[PDB]
Amino acid sequence: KDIATPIRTKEILKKYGFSFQNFLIDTNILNRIVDHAEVTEKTGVIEIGPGIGALTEQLAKRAKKVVAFEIDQRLLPILKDTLSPYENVTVIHQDVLKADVKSVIEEQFQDCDEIMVVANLPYYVTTPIIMKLLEEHLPLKGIVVMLQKEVAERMAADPSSKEYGSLSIAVQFYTEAKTVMIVPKTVFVPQPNVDSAVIRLILR
């Protein structure tokens, strides 16, 4: 049934006129992302960049609520369709860099014991969103994001590393950072240029 299966994803790409966002078409990987994010009946989840709902679905199954920030007008009718099975998924049409996320948390997660950000970001926006969120001083357990491996390498760099630098110091100032998955090129359609990684940031 799931959005992120190659047969279902392909029928969605036929329907809304998509052809050759890089799409995850493995349900296992997406569930491992949710696993590492520790999402339960207790958990509220902010997602950024839902796409067509592949990751959104898997989070929605486990969590009390999922609030999903999406900027592109064209993806809103698709999300209404693909994620219609879920009465716990609010799609906000806003740029998360502009939002007052503190007041969105109080408005949407009164029925929740902890809050996690979980995402799969494009390269150009990754570092800014992460950094906006950590600087905004929110009440989060943590942030699990899929980004490029070469960026993870620097975000979670150990101080002894040749790659430890300002980016490392920035992220580690606010969080304990660790890569928890390597996600290869071959698990996306179309195949991206490089391997990605899933980094987990737990706040202090």
Q: Is 193 annotated as a binding residue?
A: no
Q: Is 22 annotated as a binding residue?
A: yes
The crossing angle, in degrees rounded to 10, of helices 27-36 and 54-62 is 50
Contacts within 8 Å (CB) and 24+ apart, 100-107: 101/46, 101/133, 101/136, 101/138, 102/136, 102/137, 102/138, 102/139, 104/46, 104/67, 105/44, 105/46, 105/138, 105/139
The answer to whether the beta carbons of residues 101 and 132 sit under 8 Å apart is: no
Q: Is 70 annotated as a binding residue?
A: yes
Q: Is 49 annotated as a binding residue?
A: yes
Q: Is 120 annotated as a binding residue?
A: yes
Point out the annotated binding site.
22, 24, 49, 70, 95, 120
Can you say which residues are annotated as belonging to the binding site for S-adenosyl-L-methionine? Answer: 22, 24, 49, 70, 95, 120
